[PDB]
Structure formats: structure tokens, C-alpha cells
């Protein structure tokens, strides 16, 4: 079945960002295959998709139902394996015989035509038998490029629910995590974590650093990192002939805009600063900007503009790292 007992409906914290999904999944458990079929959950990374699929599976199993969980990529890989071993038929029969199929990360179905075809047939069978299907994806079906149209209509015949990890929810999670890892529910720590994380992965990442360096050790280290990013800005300046005060704003001047690009690039490439961190460094708050900025810098790679940047990288290192 491939279920990890640690995920449960009971330890799924509910907030207004994941309520629909949660409620729908729960309604479905009380009337397996008869109310909603299929259920298609979507949301960005670290948002509850896998947890919710697996919590449903654990419930259905604890109730006596036959369950299979699998990510689409492993599904694809398993189907190709059975096909060459001569067992494609045990592959189908396996999947066609469950009370509850959980296919996680459906996006990865793209390109895998055979896999899609084989999944359609499994989908139909379970469906005609009113067997429950729960899918999860990082994007809405309408954004599934590379997945057949027929699979997409089918998904759209069911219930589609977006899932989010909202602030009230992270907050509660953060409290749970701090007890998990034996830290204190201290306002500053809880606050620090709220401002600097979106995932549980990032929360555990910060916690790891806190246990290692102490909460105040992390603050010091991060302060130093910010200082260095500023040192890089000072650097790009003195070389480009633009002031600092200047380099930090949306002033499109190609004498600044082109210094802003390399800088961000240097912060990214020389100090290993995250996008968010770089974004914060250069007073602004959003996505786009940075990403494509660093892109443009790679457009210049097409050996010309490379040697400059290369030279700037090396100097920045010796002077700031
Ligand atoms: N509502 C929630 N309550 C408690 N923990 C959660 C919740 N949502 C996500 N998590 C935890 O965050 C981590 C990422 O969850 P996961 O289901 O893998 O997200 P996704 O599959 O959307 O990437 C898991 O450890 C999960 O248990
Ligand atoms: Mg997941």
C-alpha cells in the first residue's frame, strides 16, 4: 500500500486555507466512492497534499479497505517495469482491485503516454465500480500540459479543491514543531519562524540551525550574512560608478538597472543568498524581478560579458567572503 502511518486526519491541523480539501476528503470517507469521484487536490509545495492523501489512506485501511498509494512517477516507473518483466497484467489487476486509489503528484504524468493510457483504464474501472479515487497535483488540471484531454475532463467531472497553508495554520504548526524539537514557545522564536518560513521543511531547517547555534546565534549569523550582501552592493557601486543610495530602487536608468542585475547576481552566486534574502536585501518584496534579472545575466553568456561578471565574482569573494 505504501502508507506512512505518521500522517493522520487527526494530526492534520485545519485552517481556512485547507478546510475545503479537509472537509471534502472527510465527507468522502463516510461515503467512499459515492459522493465525490474523483477528488483532485492541488496546491503549492508543502501545503498538505501528501499528508492529506496518506491520512485518508490510513483511515480507509484502519476501517478495512484495500488501499494503494503511489506518486505518479513511481507509478510510471512501476508500470514500465512490469511491462518488460511480462507482468503488465499483475500491474493492472493490482490497481483495479482497490477500494481507494491515491495518486500523488499527477503533474508528473506528462509525457508518459503509456502510463496515462494505463491509468485511464484503471481510473475507468475503479470509477464504474464506484471505487474512490483521490488525486493530488501541484497545479490545476487546466494547467496539466502533457496530460491527455480525456484524463483532464474526467478529473473535471469530480471535485477540484485548492489547498493552502495559511498563516494561522503555520503558526499552530510552528508551535507543534517547537515542542517536537524541545524548544520553548517564546514569542520571538515563534515570530522569527512566522516571518521566515512557508513550509514545514523551512521550519525544520531553521530549527536545526537554532539547536546548533542557539536562537541568538542564528540571528547573529543572519545579521552577518545581510552585512555581506550590503558589502556586495557597496562593491558593485565603487566599480560601476553608482552610489549605494541609488543602487537600491526601481529607478530604470541602465546605469543603475544594469548594476542592480549583476549585484543580485553576485548576491546569489557569490554569497549563496536565497531569492527571498536577495529580494529583502534590495528593498522590494515580490518574486518576478529577481528571477528574470538573474536570467538576463545568463543571456549574456551566449566569451564576452562572462569574463567581466567572472572577474567581479572573484573580487567580491576576496573582499567580502
Ligand atoms: N495542516 C497541516 N497540519 C500539520 N502538518 C502539516 C499540515 N500541512 C502540511 N503539514 C506538514 O508539512 C509537511 C509537508 O506536507 P506535505 O503533505 O508533503 O505537503 P505537499 O505534499 O503539499 O508538499 C509534512 O510534514 C506535513 O505533515
Ligand atoms: Mg507532497
Indicate the annotated binding residues for Mg(2+).
50, 105
Q: Do 102 and 67 touch, CB atoms closer than 8 A? A: yes
Dist CA 263 CA 261 (whole Å) = 5
Q: Is the dihedral of CA 246, 250, 251, 252 positive or negative?
A: positive
Ligand 1 site, residue 49, Cβ cutoff 6 A: yes
CATH tag for 1-165 (out of 3.40.640.10, 1.10.287.310, 3.30.750.24, 3.40.50.300): 3.40.50.300
Pocket-testing residue among 48, 162, 165, ligand 1, by greatest number of atoms within 8 A of Cβ = 48
The domain segmentation of the chain, as residue ranges, is: 1-165, 166-214, 215-321
Dist CA 73 CA 83 (whole Å) = 15
- Cell triple for residue 170? 503555520
CATH tag for 215-321 (out of 1.10.10.60, 1.10.3720.10, 1.10.1750.10, 3.40.1210.10): 1.10.1750.10
Dist CA 200 CA 155 (whole Å) = 29
Give the nearest ligand 1 atom to 176 CA: 4
Domain 215-321 in the same topology as domain 1-165 = no
Residues, the chain: 321
Domain 166-214, architecture per CATH:
Orthogonal Bundle (1.10)
Q: Phi/psi of residue 299, each to 5°? A: -70, -30
Distances (CA, A) of 160 to 23, 264, 269: 13, 39, 40
Per the listing, cell 528574470 goes with 292
Dist CA 215 CA 111 (whole Å) = 46
Q: Is the dihedral of CA 254, 257, 261, 262 positive or negative?
A: positive
This structure's resolution (Å) is 2.7
3-state helix/strand/coil string of the chain? CCCCCCCCCCCCCCCCCCHHHHHHHHHHHHCCCCCCCCEEEECCCCCCHHHHHHHHHHHHHHCCCCEEEEEHHHHHHHHHHHHHHCCHHHHHHHHHCCCEEEEECHHHHCCCHHHHHHHHHHHHHHHHCCCEEEEEECCCHHHCCCCCHHHHHHHHCCEEEECCCCHHHHHHHHHHHHHHCCCCCCHHHHHHHHHCCCCHHHHHHHHHHHHHHCHHHHHHHHHHHHHHHHHHHHHHHHHHCCCHHHHCCCCCCCCCHHHHHHHHHHHHHHHCCCHHHHHHHCCCCCCCHHHHHHHHHHHCCCCCHHHHHHHHHHHHHHHHC
Strand order of the β-sheet with 159-162 is 67-71, 100-104, 132-137, 39-42, 159-162
Experimental method: X-ray
Amino acid at each position: 500500500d505504501f502508507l506512512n502511518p505518521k500522517y493522520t486526519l487527526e494530526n492534520f491541523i485545519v485552517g481556512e486555507g485547507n478546510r475545503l480539501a479537509y472537509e471534502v476528503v472527510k465527507e468522502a470517507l463516510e461515503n467512499l466512492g459515492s459522493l465525490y469521484n474523483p477528488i483532485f487536490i492541488y496546491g503549492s509545495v508543502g501545503t498538505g497534499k501528501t499528508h492529506l492523501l496518506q491520512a485518508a489512506g490510513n483511515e480507509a485501511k484502519k476501517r478495512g479497505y484495500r488501499v494503494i498509494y503511489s506518486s505518479a512517477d513511481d507509478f510510471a516507473q512501476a508500470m514500465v517495469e512490469h511491462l518488460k518483466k511480462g507482468t503488465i497484467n499483475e500491474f493492472r489487476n493490482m490497481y483495479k482491485s482497490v477500494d481507494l486509489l491515491l495518486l500523488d503528484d499527477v503533474q508528473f504524468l506528462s509525457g508518459k503516454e503509456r502510463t496515462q493510457i494505463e491509468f485511464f483504464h484503471i481510473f475507468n474501472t475503479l470509477y464504474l465500480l464506484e471505487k474512490q479515487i483521490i488525486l493530488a497535483s501541484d497545479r490545476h488540471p487546466q494547467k496539466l500540459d502533457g496530460v491527455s484531454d480525456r484524463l483532464v475532463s474526467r478529473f473535471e467531472g469530480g471535485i477540484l479543491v485548492e489547498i493552502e497553508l495559511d498563516n494561522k495554520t503555520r503558526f499552530k504548526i510552528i508551535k507543534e514543531k517547537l515542542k517536537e524539537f524541545n524548544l520553548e514557545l517564546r514569542k520571538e522564536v515563534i515570530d522569527y519562524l512566522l516571518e521566515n518560513t512557508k513550509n514545514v521543511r523551512e521550519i525544520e531547517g531553521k530549527i536545526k540551525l537554532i539547536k546548533l547555534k542557539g536562537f541568538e546565534g542564528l540571528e547573529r549569523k543572519e545579521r552577518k550574512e545581510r552585512d555581506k550582501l550590503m558589502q556586495i552592493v557597496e562593491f558593485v557601486a565603487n566599480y560601476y560608478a553608482v552610489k549605494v543610495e541609488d543602487i537600491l530602487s526601481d529607478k530604470r536608468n541602465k546605469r543603475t538597472s544594469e548594476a542592480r542585475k549583476i549585484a543580485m547576481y553576485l548576491c546569489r552566486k557569490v554569497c549563496s543568498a536565497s531569492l527571498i534574502e536577495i529580494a529583502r536585501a534590495f528593498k522590494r518584496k515580490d518574486h518576478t524581478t529577481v528571477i528574470h534579472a538573474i536570467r538576463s545575466v545568463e543571456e549574456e553568456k551566449k566569451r564576452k560579458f562572462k569574463h567581466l561578471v567572472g572577474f567581479l565574482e572573484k573580487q567580491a569573494f576576496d573582499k567580502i567572503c
